Ligand binder design. Structure first.
Ligand code: ZN
Lengths: 49, 730, 750
RNA sequence: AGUAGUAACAAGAGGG
RNA sequence: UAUACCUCUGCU
């Protein structure tokens, strides 16, 4: 069901499809979001993903 | 809109039964409850249909049939009833309802259905545009082989084809995976465009694509052409005793045409060698032969296949041999040897398995490119020697790197570090290793290895670092600053007079043709292949037996040298032909000299082996070997075998399972205890009598003196008494 | 002159006129009544072949289980099942030596299957014994019933969807000592009608708990019945049907044995007819090439007598464990389940018997369960004696059957035992004057023995024969025979220096298949086509087979040509179609059109063949996608029929979906029985699946995967599709609110 | 009676 | 008990 929600968006608005599962998607900017918050500060998990 | 679907779901959820099933049963569990049924699979559908077609209302149909067609037609036939079909909301219906629909029902647009059912309509397109030749009658030998049954398949895996189908008909419900290959993307664009705005069940479109795209095979008995479009029409083109010549519509693929051209040329060269004037015979066959109805000579003028037999045919007609190619921007030109192909997977230094079309055998190239040239000597995964020269050291070294990769050594494969990925047209795997080593070759040269050489004036070595050394060099590398002619016996040579191509060194691997070959030649038999040669040759001897038997008695040297035995000789090993002829002729003259002993079957059996200049050797033979479709078969000298079987019950000689004709009924009542024409300089007398000593093998027969009798293991578990005759035969 | 057809054999060889010995144009034998007489025979015969073995009462079932293996070595040629564990393992090891990495790969391929295989896979299959109802039901129905009763009790690991979890639930369900089941029963109510009160039969359901034995017996029970329509045999025999518990374990064990047999040249299974013949041709080629000119060659045309009755479940446990050596213990113990259940299997004894009183003129039915508590004055002498022997094995209405097997239980692993005996005959193992090779599929085998002299063959036969006896395989001395290599027989293929045709084998397939008008036309023409290719059906006879098929098809479906003077229910409506149609040649045969088929046509479907010649309106009606006659099934079951030759494989056919692709009416006898309610369950299940497909079109092609609800999935799709329809497409703002309020309303009703 | 052939059919179940 | 009817089923 998660990928059906992703693909339904990309069909009408001709955009890229990600490899792994996103968590959110903004309809104004047309950008996917991938959450990954943790006990580390910022740079150790930002540049890894 | 999607308004009525959610409205009905609300109406279903209002029902307390349906809301329970919809909530309790999961998506994975829905596949089980979908197939939940009282209905058995019918054991005897043929009986039930005959039972049910006598009934008024045997067909079940959707309840909405009551709103579409009338209850009664113009002749008062009841078309539908209100009786629900056991276990559904469908209603029981007359066959007259189906007829009423087909004559007076709602019309719909179905003009693009031939694109949905393309696999089916392609069969009619090939048949409609097909061309029939004549029907020849003969014993059709059929090899049981795995072959394609789905012509025009765009070759993908089941999972790859599943992704393509999903993209075309269910675009919104494609999973995590995406279209990987450029084949998958281009097929999807074509399918999306062809099938757009076509009112038909998506279930049926998914089904027809699954059948069309994916390759399917079956074990079938095939005579002749094995390619998909000929396999499609086996029922039409072959029977037990006939071949209906037929070319399907559309053009043959180059793969099938190159494979069958090689087989045609090989068969033409193998035939010509054993004739008196090979080049005239080869030329005679080349102008008469056709492949897929296209003449062989215009194929040889346009087709660039590089193969020893094809090149002998090209050389005999004065056509340029495709002697050259390019790789890394250098023109390779073969001056000696030959290329033999073998696709295999090998591990690199990064443990990456990759399928390489590796070349084998000893070859020699004169290589030349931009500002540098070389003389390469190569073997199977071996750089034997490379003498390189050029305007600059970099130009020499750049050519050197190209040759080292072109050699396909295990040195250079193991010296690769990392994964190989280049481009969005992706190149073949030879260029993946080249472009890797063109960028960085630090490990290549370290792992290649050095060798010591003698200081020759003009030659110098190239070290791993890049220095020029005089007495040291990389393994094989040295640095230093085409018409053809073909003789009567098909030997291809150069201006200097050195051997380029030999008929003896043509590959003996037959293989079954992909497209039909017709040699319209008196030098060849009616049907292609080696089983045909056996059957037609033995059929011919029986048919003309009365003429050839008296010709056997009076003047045997003209019988032995008959041109009809020449095809048979291709099946005998080259080396064996002479000694086999020596053995056969000695055995035949024994039958003439030892009066009384005459066996018509034994003459007929061995007669084709005579057709060669005989050797003076004294070896014994319990069988003659015959090469039939790769495997060796052994025709036994005494009695029946797979290759030759005289059946007394039928009064028929069976050659490889097929009756070859009845010999005269005289030969049933034709025998004598003494059997000549089995062992050279000996005579089989009768049963094994133990008075004359213990059993000797056929190799041990040299011990026995002149006129001495002994027991021998002759063949097929029989032990037999044999005497050495005193005076030997001509 | 007295005519005698068999005198043709004086001139024509037997193999060349073998069709004259196949009487396959007549109706084959059928059993009338029950197969209780045969099931008892099989059970009694099976135990007699193992009689010198060891009896032990089972801890769990209390059933009397005969163990013949590692027992006294046989002292006669009678059928024996005294297999020796050590001798079986030597042969299976000998197979491992000869094919290094075969057992490794076969196991690894089976492990990959076990991880990926869903519970769905058990819906695909023939009739299965339902322990829930003590009767046979379709595979999917028996699965759903077994899952439902499992879910009502404490067993929901299969919730995940993977099959191995369902298999755990089956092993965990033996621990329950109060397994609840809902049996159905009839009640006689009365209701008023305007002004007389009429009796009303209704069906209620009663919850019954089972004993720990009761459930255990039922899970190990395999149903029995007589095999009908079987050729070449005077007497009927019993066939068996596995239960839902053992089924899933059997799937994976046969899947291993399949992967083993797939890479064994000596196995006839699982390949088709032509490939079977190619395999026999290869071994003859291989035996002649390896031999010398001094040597002999004989071929046994081979039948194994009492094949299933003498193959033992304990021996299959030895094979499965040896084949899986060095693999993870979870995988070894999973595949070991099916042999264990087969070793502790019990057999249902069928319907029972019917009695008859001539003077009183009455008949009556006693159940097979009554065979314990019943007087023997009723039965005849042979039947009595069998009941007396069966009582010693009887356990809760079902006879125990530890040793042996029965037809329909188990498939390919038995061939691997036979193949290991064939593999023993390599020259490098035997190292003596004789040696052998061959092919085998089940009881049928073709053994080729080479040696230096005729007595070497006799020693080789005896060595093969006795080695087969050491693993409970009994070669028939009466049905098998031997001759010099050149002719033989194998599964009714006849070799005479090459395979000859056996057309008469295929005569039952020439006729109207009885699926529907569309499918049968495609099936009929393809049968003619394939027989021209595979069984030497000549061109003139093939033309006549088209001519006779059209006749049979025209009469069966009452769809004679539109210009005929016949009178049926269909002639008038077809006549109206005939007259209005401009291009008559375009009409299908089912619509009173002409036969387009000759030899060259047979591979082209009829609609496809007539397309260009059709009237546009007729073509538009014929292939109308919104027509009420077609049942829009899944892609996996599109253009499939069922056919018997083996067990019963599916037949795929090439056909364009039209109004002629209809389905005949269902059987309605369930309406009178206590299982009447199953029809409404089915009606409700289909309506739920029909609505799901409107939200998930893909479900008809590829089966969907999720542990979430059907409703919650449909709800999720209703919101997101309506989002995209408004955010970029053709839908109003008021419609988006109307859909999302309905989704809120549906969520409010749980 | 007749079908049939190792056991059945020669209607079964219900309106009780 | 009988004789008329009526309903369901024809692979379940
Ligand atoms: Zn007719």
């Amino acid at each position: 069901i998660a990928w059906t929600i992703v693909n339904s968006i990309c069909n009408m608005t001709e955009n890229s499809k990600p490899r792994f599962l996103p968590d959110l998607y903004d309809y104004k900017t047309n950008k996917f979001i991938e959450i990954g918050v943790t006990r580390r500060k910022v740079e150790d998990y930002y540049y890894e993903k | 809109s999607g308004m009525e679907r959610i409205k009905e779901l609300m109406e279903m959820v209002k029902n307390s039964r349906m809301r329970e099933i919809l909530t309790t049963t999961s998506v994975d569990h829905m596949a089980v409850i979908k197939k939940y049924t009282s209905g058995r699979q019918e054991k005897n559908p043929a009986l039930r249909m005959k039972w049910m077609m006598a009934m008024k209302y045997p067909i079940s149909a959707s309840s909405r049939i009551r709103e579409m067609i009338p209850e009664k037609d113009e002749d008062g036939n009841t078309l539908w009833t209100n009786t629900k079909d056991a276990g559904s909301n469908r209603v029981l219906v007359s066959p007259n309802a189906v007829t009423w629909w087909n004559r007076a029902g709602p019309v719909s647009d179905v003009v693009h259905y031939p694109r949905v059912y393309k696999m089916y309509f392609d069969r009619l397109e090939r048949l409609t545009h097909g061309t029939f030749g004549p029907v020849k009658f003969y014993n059709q030998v059929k090899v049981r082989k795995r072959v394609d049954i789905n012509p025009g398949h765009k070759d993908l895996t089941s999972r790859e084809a599943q992704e393509v189908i999903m993209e075309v008909v269910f675009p919104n419900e494609v999973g995590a995976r995406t279209l990987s290959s450029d084949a998958q993307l281009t097929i999807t664009k074509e399918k999306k465009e062809e099938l757009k705005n076509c009112k038909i069940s998506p279930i049926m479109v998914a089904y027809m694509l699954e059948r069309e795209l994916v390759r399917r095979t079956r074990f079938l008995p095939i005579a002749g052409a094995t390619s998909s479009t000929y396999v499609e029409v086996l029922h039409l083109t072959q029977g037990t005793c006939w071949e209906q010549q037929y070319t399907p519509g559309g053009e043959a693929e180059n793969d099938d045409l190159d494979q069958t051209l090689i087989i045609a040329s090989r068969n033409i060269v193998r035939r010509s060698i054993v004739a008196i004037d090979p080049l005239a015979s080869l030329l005679s066959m080349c102008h008469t032969t056709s492949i897929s109805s296209e003449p062989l000579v215009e194929i040889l003028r346009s087709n660039p296949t590089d193969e020893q037999a094809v090149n002998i045919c090209k050389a005999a007609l004065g056509i340029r041999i495709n002697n050259s190619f390019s790789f890394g921007g250098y023109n390779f030109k073969r001056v000696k040897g030959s290329s033999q192909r073998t696709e295999k997977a090998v591990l690199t230094g990064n443990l990456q398995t990759l399928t390489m079309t590796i070349f084998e055998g000893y070859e020699e190239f004169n290589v030349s490119g931009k500002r540098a040239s070389a003389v390469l000597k190569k073997g199977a995964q071996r750089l034997i020697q490379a003498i390189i020269g050029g305007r600059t050291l970099e130009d020499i070294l750049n050519l050197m790197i190209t040759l080292m990769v072109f050699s396909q050594e295990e040195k250079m494969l193991k010296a690769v570090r990392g994964d190989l990925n280049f481009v969005n047209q992706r190149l073949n795997p030879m260029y993946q290793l080249l472009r890797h080593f063109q960028k960085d070759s630090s490990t290549l040269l370290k792992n290649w290895g050095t060798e010591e050489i003698d200081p020759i004036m003009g030659i110098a070595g190239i070290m791993p670092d890049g220095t020029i050394n005089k007495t040291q060099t990389l393994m094989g590398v040295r640095l230093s600053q085409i018409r053809v002619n073909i003789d009567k016996y098909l030997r291809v040579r150069n201006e200097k007079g050195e051997l380029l191509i030999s008929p003896e060194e043509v590959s003996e691997a037959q293989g079954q043709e992909k497209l039909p070959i017709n040699y319209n030649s008196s030098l060849m038999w009616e049907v292609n292949g080696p089983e045909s040669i056996l059957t037609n040759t033995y059929h011919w001897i029986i048919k003309n037996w009365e003429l050839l038997k008296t010709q056997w008695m009076t003047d045997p040297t003209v019988l032995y040298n008959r041109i009809e035995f020449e095809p048979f000789q291709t099946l005998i090993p080259k080396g064996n032909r002479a000694i086999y002829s020596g053995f056969t002729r000695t055995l035949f003259q024994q039958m003439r000299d030892v009066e009384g002993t005459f066996d018509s079957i034994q003459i007929i059996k061995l007669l084709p082996f005579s057709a060669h200049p005989p050797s003076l050797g004294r070896t014994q033979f319990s069988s003659f070997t015959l090469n039939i479709r790769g495997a060796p078969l052994r025709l036994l000298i005494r009695g029946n075998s797979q290759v030759f079987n005289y059946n007394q019950m039928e009064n028929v000689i069976i050659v490889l399972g097929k009756s070859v004709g009845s010999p005269e009924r005289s030969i049933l009542t034709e025998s004598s205890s003494i059997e000549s024409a089995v062992l050279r300089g000996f005579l089989i007398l009768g049963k094994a009598n133990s008075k004359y000593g213990p059993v000797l093998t056929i190799g041990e027969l040299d011990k026995l003196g002149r006129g001495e009798k002994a027991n021998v293991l002759i063949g097929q578990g029989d032990t037999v008494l044999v005497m050495k005759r005193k005076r030997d035969s001509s | 002159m007295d005519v005698n057809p068999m005198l043709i054999f004086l001139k024509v060889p037997v193999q060349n006129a073998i069709s004259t010995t196949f009487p396959y144009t007549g109706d084959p034998p059928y059993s009338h009544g029950t197969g209780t007489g045969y099931t008892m025979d099989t059970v009694i015969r099976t135990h007699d072949y193992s009689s010198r073995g060891i009896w032990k009462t089972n801890s769990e079932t209390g059933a009397q289980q005969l163990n013949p293996i590692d027992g006294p070595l046989p002292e006669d040629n009678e059928p024996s099942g005294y297999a020796q564990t050590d001798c079986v393992l030597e042969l299976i090891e000998g197979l491992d030596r000869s094919h290094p990495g075969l057992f490794e790969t076969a196991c690894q391929e089976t492990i990959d299957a076990i991880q990926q295989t869903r519970v769905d896979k058990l819906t695909q299959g023939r009739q299965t014994y339902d322990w829930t109802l003590n009767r046979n039901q379709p595979a999917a129905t028996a699965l759903a019933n077994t899952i439902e009763v499992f879910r009502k009790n404490g067993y929901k690991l299969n919730e995940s969807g993977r099959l191995i979890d369902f298999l755990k639930d089956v092993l965990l369900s033996f621990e329950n000592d109060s397994m609840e089941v809902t049996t159905h029963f009839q009640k006689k109510k009365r209701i008023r009608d305007n002004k007389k009160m009429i009796t009303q039969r209704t069906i209620g359901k009663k919850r019954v708990k089972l004993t720990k034995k009761n459930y255990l017996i039922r899970a190990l029970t395999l149903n029995t019945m007589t095999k009908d329509a079987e050729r070449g045999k005077l007497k009927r025999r019993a066939i068996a049907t596995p239960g839902m518990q053992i089924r899933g374990f059997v799937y994976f064990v046969e899947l291993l044995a399949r992967n083993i047999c797939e890479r064994l040249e000596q196995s006839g299974l699982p390949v088709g007819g032509n490939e079977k013949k190619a395999k026999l041709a290869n071994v003859i080629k291989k035996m002649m090439a390896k031999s010398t000119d001094e040597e002999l060659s004989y071929t046994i045309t081979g039948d194994n007598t009492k094949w299933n009755e003498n193959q033992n479940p304990r021996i299959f446990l030895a094979m499965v464990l040896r084949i899986t050596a060095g693999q993870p213990e979870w995988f070894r113990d999973l595949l070991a389940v099916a042999p264990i259940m087969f070793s502790n299997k019990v057999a249902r004894l069928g319907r029972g018997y019917m009695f008859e009183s001539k003077s009183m003129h009455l008949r009556t039915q006693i159940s097979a369960e009554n065979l314990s508590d019943i007087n023997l004055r009723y039965f005849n002498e042979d039947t009595k004696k069998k009941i007396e022997k069966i009582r010693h094995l009887m356990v809760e209405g079902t006879a125990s059957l530890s040793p042996g097997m029965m037809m329909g239980m188990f498939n390919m692993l038995s061939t691997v035992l036979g193949v290991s005996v064939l593999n023993l005959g390599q020259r490098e193992i035997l190292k003596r004057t004789y040696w052998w090779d061959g092919l085998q599929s089940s009881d049928d085998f073709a053994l080729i023995i080479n040696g230096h002299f005729k007595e070497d063959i006799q020693q080789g036969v005896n060595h093969f024969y006795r080695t087969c006896k050491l693993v409970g395989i009994n070669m028939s001395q009466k049905k098998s025979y031997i001759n010099k290599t050149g002719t033989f027989e194998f599964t009714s293929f006849f070799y005479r220096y090459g395979f000859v045709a056996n057309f008469s084998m295929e005569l039952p397939s020439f006729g109207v298949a009885g699926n529907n008008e569309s499918a049968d036309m495609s099936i009929g023409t393809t049968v003619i086509k394939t027989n021209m290719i595979n069984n030497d059906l000549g061109p003139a006879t093939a033309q006549m087979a088209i001519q006779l098929f059209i006749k049979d098809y025209r009469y069966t479906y009452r769809c004679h040509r539109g210009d005929t003077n016949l009178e049926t229910r269909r002639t008038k409506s077809i006549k109206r179609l005939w007259t209005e149609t401009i291009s008559k040649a375009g009409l299908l045969v089912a619509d009173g059109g002409p036969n387009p088929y000759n030899l060259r046509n047979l591979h082209i479907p009829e609609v496809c063949l007539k397309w260009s010649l059709m009237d546009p309106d007729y073509r538009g009606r014929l292939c109308n996608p919104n027509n009420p006659f077609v049942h829009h099934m899944e892609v996996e079951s599109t253009n499939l029929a069922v056919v018997m030759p083996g067990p019963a494989k599916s037949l795929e056919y090439d056909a364009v979906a039209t109004t002629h692709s209809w389905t005949p009416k269902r059987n309605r006898s369930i309406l009178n029985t206590n299982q009447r309610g199953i029809l409404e369950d089915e009606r409700i299940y289909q309506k739920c699946c029909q609505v799901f497909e409107k939200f998930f079109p893909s479900s008809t092609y590829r089966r969907p995967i999720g542990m979430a609800s059907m409703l919650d999935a449909m709800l999720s799709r209703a919101r997101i599709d309506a989002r995209i329809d408004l955010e970029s497409g053709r839908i109003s703002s008021q419609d988006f609110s109307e859909i999302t309020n309905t989704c809120k309303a549906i969520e409010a009703l749980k």
